[PDB]
Amino acid sequence: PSLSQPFRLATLPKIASLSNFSLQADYVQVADGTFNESTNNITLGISGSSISQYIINPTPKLTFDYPIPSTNIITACNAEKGQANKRNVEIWAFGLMVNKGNYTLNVITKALFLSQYKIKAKAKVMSIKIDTKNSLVIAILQNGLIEIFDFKLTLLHSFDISYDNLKYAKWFTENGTEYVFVLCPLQDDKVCYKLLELTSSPIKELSSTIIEGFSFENSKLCYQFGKLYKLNQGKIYIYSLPHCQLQQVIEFPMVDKLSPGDDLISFQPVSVNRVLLTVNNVIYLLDLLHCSTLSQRELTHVKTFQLLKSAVINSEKSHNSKTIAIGISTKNGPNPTSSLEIINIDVGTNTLKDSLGKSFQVVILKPLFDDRVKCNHCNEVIEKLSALQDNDITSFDDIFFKELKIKEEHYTEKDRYISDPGFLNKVLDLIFGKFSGNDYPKTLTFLLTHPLFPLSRTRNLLSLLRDQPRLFKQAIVTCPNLPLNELLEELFSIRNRELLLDISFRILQDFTRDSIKQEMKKLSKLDVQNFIEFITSQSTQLFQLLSLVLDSIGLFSLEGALLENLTLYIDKQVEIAERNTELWNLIDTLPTYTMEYLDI
Amino acid sequence: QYKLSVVSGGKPALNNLSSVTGNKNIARLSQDQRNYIIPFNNQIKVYSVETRQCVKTLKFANNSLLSGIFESIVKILLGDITVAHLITVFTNNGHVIVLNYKGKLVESPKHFKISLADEKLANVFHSEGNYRILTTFKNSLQSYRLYALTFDDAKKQFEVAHQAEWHNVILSNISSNGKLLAHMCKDHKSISVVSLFDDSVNLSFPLGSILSSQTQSLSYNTRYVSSMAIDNMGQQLAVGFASGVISIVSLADLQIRLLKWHIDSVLSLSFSHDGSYLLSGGWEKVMSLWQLETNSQQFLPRLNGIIIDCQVLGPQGNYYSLILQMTENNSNSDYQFLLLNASDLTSKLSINGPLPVFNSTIKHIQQPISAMNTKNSNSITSLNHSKKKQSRKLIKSRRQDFTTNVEINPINKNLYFPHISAVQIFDFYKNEQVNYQYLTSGVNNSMGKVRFELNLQDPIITDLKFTKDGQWMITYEIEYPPNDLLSSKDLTHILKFWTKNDNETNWNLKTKVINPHGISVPITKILPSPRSVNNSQGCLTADNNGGLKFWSFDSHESNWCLKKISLPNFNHFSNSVSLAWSQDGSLIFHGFDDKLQILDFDTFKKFEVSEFTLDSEIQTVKLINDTNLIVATRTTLNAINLLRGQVINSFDLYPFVNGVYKNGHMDRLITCDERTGNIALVINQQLTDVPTINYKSRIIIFDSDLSTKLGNFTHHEYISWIGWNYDTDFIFLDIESTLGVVGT
Amino acid sequence: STARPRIITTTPEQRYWRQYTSAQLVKEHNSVTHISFNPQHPHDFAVTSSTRVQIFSSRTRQVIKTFSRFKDVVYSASFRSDGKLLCAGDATGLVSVYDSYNPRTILLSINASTHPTHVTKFHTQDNKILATASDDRVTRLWDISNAYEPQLELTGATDYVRTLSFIPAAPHLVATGSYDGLIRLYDTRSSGSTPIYSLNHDQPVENVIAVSPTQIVSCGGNNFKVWDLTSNKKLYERGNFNKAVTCLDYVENFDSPMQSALIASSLDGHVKVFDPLDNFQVKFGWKFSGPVLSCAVSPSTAQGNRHLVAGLSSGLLAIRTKKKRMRAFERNINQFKWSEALDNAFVPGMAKELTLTVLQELRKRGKVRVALYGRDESTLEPLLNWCLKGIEDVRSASIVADWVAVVLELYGNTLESSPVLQELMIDLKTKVRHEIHKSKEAQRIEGMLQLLT
RNA sequence: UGCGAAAGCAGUUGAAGACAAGUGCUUGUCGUUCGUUAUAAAUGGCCUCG
């Protein structure tokens, strides 16, 4: 999953209504019909400016514009292509608002103006759906009236939800049938949720419920695949249709730090259980199912970015993991300028593969039993060790072994309680500061044998122990997770025979053949050349290591004079080995007339 | 919430006394001869012979008296002595219980108690209203007393009176009529036969007289008697020898008659009612009818187990009762009771319990005597040393794994036991065996192994698993080369894919892979693939070298083909590897030695922290849910969130699990549900004042992340294995061959 | 009791084609030019040879109708879709139409041109129209009713046109391939006489076949290339052939594990099977004595034994057709006759594989030394003779080593007094030494292979 | 026998009692015990129902 750089579609006009950035998204409407995964067009209603249709690819361009008076506010806008009485046409339905005194519903038919119609709507047109199959325009009003008109804006049907001040309405299609769910605030943070099915009455009420504890004023609402997501006070509440029962709650810590009032938050669904959350100029692609931050991107060149709409992928049925989202970006500067910007989004495969280690959520051994059978204080010790004077080996070792009741200088299974990484790392830090030069405490020997030796101190560890052969030897044999590069450079640098053998075994034991080859190519031609000379002067692992060198050298780099010698050396080792084999397998494994002298 | 309850049965009960032979079988056929009564270690079952189904079941757990009393049954007698479906159970301690079949158990049976003074009841028998009881009293030879038992109505008590006494009884046998007793003593030895209810028969003679001279020159096996039998009339006595020679003696004049077919120690000898036929059985796996007028012989070979005991059971000899052993499983003594229709020698009724194969021997299981000491048998001298060694191993030694692999069928919920070279399909809902299928080559039923052939090892099924769909069976086998050969050290590793339809009951082999992953490399771990990937027809196989192979079933080939491979040629060998697959199937967790790797399935390679170092070797790696992964190392267990990559909880297993078990057994001891949570099982030795053979088990239910303990339950015996049934309940197998269940 | 377990002793597409085992070779009097299969049951196939056309019965695999009225060399025997008619071409240029299985009646005789007419094909979709191509380089489209003038006369070929194909689902489309190296497409709905467009093969076109409605496979020169008309370009090209590919045939929806097969003659004695689903890749092939000029297979709905037919310049016709108790040693082992079972293993005319099994069974049985106790030099040699040859084989190499050691450990002193057995060991020494020597390079070579990777 | 990988790495195979044979002495044995992690070989091979 990844988030691209936004690219500009258009620059918003400098209108007073659009000057208030916090409400700017409210003044820009995106048509649901024209904005989806497969459509290359976006129809956008900019309040006081126009309703404009743009093509996105290959380059953003304005294809159509319908001007609107500056004093009018676009509350709902939709555009859909279909066949009308038959000609291929595009139907645009929009609602405009003049000072709250009069409310206009407008329908325009264009040939792919064929017609234009305008009527007075009783209350705020909030959601508009176009049914090209039946040539119907369905308008939901804030007073709760759902009115079905024809393309000529002749009222065919009217339905009352019995609740006013409707605040959220969303259309969706399931199994080929059209549905709409509407939310109406009630007092004391109560909400009327009504689910309606579109089919004597074409509108059938399927569900009606009252939800308590549901505030709107600070609540951000979106819907996708039967799930309603509500972002409020840094918590995302996931409700499930058709009963809109609260299914889960996700705590999102990175919003909890936001001061209420200054931070501009926008939110959309982008795929199954995947959402996009923008805080000021920062953008997050989040997986709600696994509670992970799939992606993050900061727009340094803009003060804020607000989402308007996103083309949602049904990843369960779609092999496409790629979509787009549209929003408003507001720049930094004394004269801020707002522009429409589109972001290319890779949601991903919707697998647990994507979400690992990306959680947005931020030890002591516990007995098995609380309470006649055979049996087979970190901070305090850290402080005691730190209080010791510099270069006091005896006191350091005494305190460590006695306080931790350790009996052996090497790690044993009895020392499990000590395995907490935090305590060990501090002890390592103390030893380095406390002791320098040629004398180290026995505590290191214990720590080297420890399986949970921190990875952070692995680097240069062999370098530190070069001076003491024993400490160096102990590290190779037992100390875990030693970096391969240090082992290789140290292998070709050591002239001591014994350490060369142990290192090769440790390298070959803990690293795959493929891994070791690549580093060994980086090694200089001279060092490898020196190494080969040493072999000329358990051994099978070393010989196996030699075979590994030869490939890393490559047929080209090999030089004839040396190769003749090595050819001689191995040939002598051939007959020695073959001779040995025969010895080993070896160790596994009447006459008619006779003349004889009797004894008396 | 959860609760534990025993479900299945156990092994059939046997009269496990060394001296007693010819009478090991305690089960009794009804007087109407329509149903068979079999006492088990934990239950008594009544099977109608005609339908060959268990008509009635009587659990000691249900009855308070039986629960308190159960000590093992020494005998069953049809009807009631005190007084038409009554039976009397005599146990070793002396409790006499009058119980009823064909009906409902009465919660107040006529419990009684015979009074014995430091005597262990061995046998009881009757002819017409008269009852004698044989008892054991204490050179390593047990002595015996014959008492007279009668019930007095006035006191309602069983009064016991002394008749006879014998010392250092080596071997003993009772006539088919139940009226004559033949026994051997060291007073080397002497055989004496005595009438029980009368003084008519009283004879004795040294073993030397019947014993021949050439055998005297030969080894002790020829002089060693393995079985004896007495005719009802007492005129004939058959003695079997370890060498496999049978010898009939005429008691009137001590005339000897040799019948020699068995090549190994004859284990069971029994005379027919008239005395014209002699039944013999031994290691040959073949029952022989010796026709004595002509010394002809007929053979019923091919039987499942060697013949421990054999009898003629009927007023007219209509049926034969046989006892089979299945010596292949050295860990446990696997007894199977066969009732054959004498007319046609066909199985009228086969009875057995679950047949798990434990990793090591348990309690006091000893291999049967054979001519020579082998892996599957003990020589004459080897018996005492082996018994002492077994006891001292159970006491002093610390490796006490006694863990068995068991598998559960998703489609049928049948229980699969990987027997040696074979699989038992056992239905725990009905507590009856449904099938026994041989899944390997080898000398498995081709014959009865004898003498050095008994040293041969048949292929061993190490790992058995099903696919999630359940229509496929993956099996991993190890074939051991014969000894005394150049290629005597190159074990062969085999993998087999099997199928069957739901209606069909026998798996048919679909593909065979010889030497997977190369030569001499064991398949230490196998994991069927989840439903998401290849709709449950894939699998993963993992070695001790860290190599992984992903196989899938290809429709085009119609066969199983190697889709992916990762062969990092590591040089260190460790049998401690664990494998887990995420439910979505995207990723695989592979714990090898002390380090865990997260490998992406698509690339089948490490993720791009993939590496998790642990304190010690991983025994088990499992994910209770997609979020959390539970990893068990030999010193502790740790719950990690993959989401944040940190340990939630850590529990120290060292005090209980240090070296008691070999690596890999924590996999089968640790079980997980896919909905509610997982379970940890720990078995400990109970010792009062040096360790004792009896054990105690504790099962603990843990939630996902191991935050809390849902429940903690205690069982009185070693729970060999525990697994998660596909229902919420978990099934657990106990070394008593007892399958209980823990569930809501 | 239980019955006795009985002693237990490539690609699916390849295995299917292997089932055409029955091979019959027939000789014709001149080069066999064209081979056709009747679309209708019994799907009898026609061969064009010399001055005659012969119809062969599928089941009998023998000539049933002989058409000898043709005067000069015959160049075609194509049937109509119904199969009730068959059309043919002659060097004189006259094209004759006969009733199939009725040689005598000349139903329609048309003189296409003075030049030879090499290709005559009934239109698959439409029966009444018959297309004729000639050395005049005009591919006239004739009608059964109109025998005096062609319905249409396609032109534009500057060289010999010897290939004519009708595209399924596109009856109007006609494909022509000339020795120009150009494949020309025509629409009969239009006025015609001019190609819709030309496809360049760059080499003389010997046969053009429409594999599918949108895909057309053209075999010309040393390679065959598949062209899609929608893209108007060659999707794929295979040039494994060495001689110039001559004839090409395609079958679909037949019972093989492969859905569709493409058989291509090479003229180098090879006809090879290509699978369209896997990008027309080589899956099978056969070799013949000489150049292959014609190849054919039974149509999809054969309803009987399938037939593969190959035509050679020598006149040879090859037909490959796909037609639609316990042993002694087993007794010895079951009867525990260990020594005799080993004797049965080394008997004249005994399969090597079976010989291994009995030896494997005895070893698995734990009966090895026992089988060899009662033996001398006379009865030991047969085992040794087998051991001398078995050592070469990889599968037996481990087994022979096992057996040889036991007899060696068991018959030391006997070997001393027996000179014949000694020589058997000496040659046994040499061969194992060679087997050592052969193995020794193998470790050298395998390591060498490792260097490159 | 312990550990481990399958390769292998270490460590064991003692004492008493009784019996038999041969000549108090010698040898061999143990349905005898205590302690340690701790060749075989009585001529003797698998049913029938097509």
From Swiss-Prot, chain A:
Keywords for this protein: Nucleus, Phosphoprotein, Ribonucleoprotein, Ribosome biogenesis, rRNA processing, Transcription
Function: Involved in nucleolar processing of pre-18S ribosomal RNA. Also has a role in nuclear tRNA export. It acts between the steps of tRNA maturation/aminoacylation and its subsequent translocation out of the nucleus. Required for optimal pre-ribosomal RNA transcription by RNA polymerase I together with a subset of U3 proteins required for transcription (t-UTPs).
Domain of life: Eukaryota
An annotated GO BP: positive regulation of transcription by RNA polymerase I
InterPro entries tied to this protein: Utp8_b-prop, Utp8_C
Matches recorded under Pfam families: Utp8_b_propeller, Utp8_C
GO molecular function, one term: U3 snoRNA binding
Subunit relationships: Interacts with snoRNA U3. Interacts with MPP10 and UTP25. Component of the ribosomal small subunit (SSU) processome composed of at least 40 protein subunits and snoRNA U3. In the absence of snoRNA3, forms a complex with other t-UTPs. This complex can associate with pre-18S ribosomal RNAs.
Keyword ATP-binding: no
Localization of this protein: Nucleus, Nucleolus
Name recorded for this polypeptide: U3 small nucleolar RNA-associated protein 8
Extra facts: Present with 16800 molecules/cell in log phase SD medium.
GO CC terms in record: 90S preribosome; nucleolus; rDNA heterochromatin; small-subunit processome; t-UTP complex
Swiss-Prot record, chain B:
InterPro entries hit by this protein: WD40/YVTN_repeat-like_dom_sf (IPR015943), WD40_repeat_dom_sf (IPR036322), WD40_rpt (IPR001680), WDR75 (IPR053826)
GO BP term, pick one: positive regulation of transcription by RNA polymerase I
GO CC annotations on file: 90S preribosome; nucleolus; nucleoplasm; peroxisome; rDNA heterochromatin; small-subunit processome; t-UTP complex
GO molecular function list: mRNA binding; RNA binding; U3 snoRNA binding
Alphabetically ordered keywords of this record: Nucleus, Repeat, Ribonucleoprotein, Ribosome biogenesis, rRNA processing, Transcription, WD repeat
WD repeats: 261-300, 456-508, 518-561, 571-608
UniProt cross-references to Pfam families, sorted A to Z: WD40
Predominant location category: nucleus
Transmembrane domains' residue ranges: none
Compartment(s) where it occurs, according to its Swiss-Prot or TrEMBL record: Nucleus, Nucleolus
Additional information: Present with 6560 molecules/cell in log phase SD medium.
Quaternary structure annotation from Swiss-Prot or TrEMBL: Interacts with snoRNA U3. Interacts with MPP10. Component of the ribosomal small subunit (SSU) processome composed of at least 40 protein subunits and snoRNA U3. In the absence of snoRNA3, forms a complex with other t-UTPs. This complex can associate with pre-18S ribosomal RNAs.
Entry function: Involved in nucleolar processing of pre-18S ribosomal RNA. Required for optimal pre-ribosomal RNA transcription by RNA polymerase I together with a subset of U3 proteins required for transcription (t-UTPs).
Protein name in UniProt: NET1-associated nuclear protein 1
Record organism: Saccharomyces cerevisiae (strain ATCC 204508 / S288c) (Baker's yeast)
This protein's encoding gene: NAN1
Curated annotation (Swiss-Prot), chain C:
Name of one Pfam family that matches: WD40
Keyword flag Transport: no
UniProt entry tagged with the keyword Transport: no
One GO BP annotation of this record: maturation of SSU-rRNA from tricistronic rRNA transcript (SSU-rRNA, 5.8S rRNA, LSU-rRNA)
Localization per record: Nucleus, Nucleolus
PANTHER family, A to Z: U3 SMALL NUCLEOLAR RNA-ASSOCIATED PROTEIN 15 HOMOLOG, UTP15 U3 SMALL NUCLEOLAR RNA-ASSOCIATED PROTEIN 15 FAMILY MEMBER
This protein's name: U3 small nucleolar RNA-associated protein 15
Coiled-coil boundaries: none
Quaternary data: Interacts with snoRNA U3. Interacts with MPP10. Component of the ribosomal small subunit (SSU) processome composed of at least 40 protein subunits and snoRNA U3. In the absence of snoRNA3, forms a complex with other t-UTPs. This complex can associate with pre-18S ribosomal RNAs.
InterPro entries: U3_snoRNA-assocProt_15_C (IPR018983), WD40/YVTN_repeat-like_dom_sf (IPR015943), WD40_repeat_CS (IPR019775), WD40_repeat_dom_sf (IPR036322), WD40_rpt (IPR001680)
Entries under SMART domains matching the protein: WD40
Note: Present with 358 molecules/cell in log phase SD medium.
Source superkingdom: Eukaryota
Major subcellular site: nucleus
The protein's role, per its UniProt record: Involved in nucleolar processing of pre-18S ribosomal RNA. Required for optimal pre-ribosomal RNA transcription by RNA polymerase I together with a subset of U3 proteins required for transcription (t-UTPs).
WD repeats by residue range: 27-68, 69-108, 114-152, 156-196, 200-237, 240-284
Species the sequence originates in: Saccharomyces cerevisiae (strain ATCC 204508 / S288c) (Baker's yeast)
UniProt keyword terms in alphabetical order: Nucleus, Repeat, Ribonucleoprotein, Ribosome biogenesis, rRNA processing, Transcription, WD repeat
Cellular component terms (Gene Ontology): 90S preribosome; nucleolus; nucleoplasm; rDNA heterochromatin; small-subunit processome; t-UTP complex
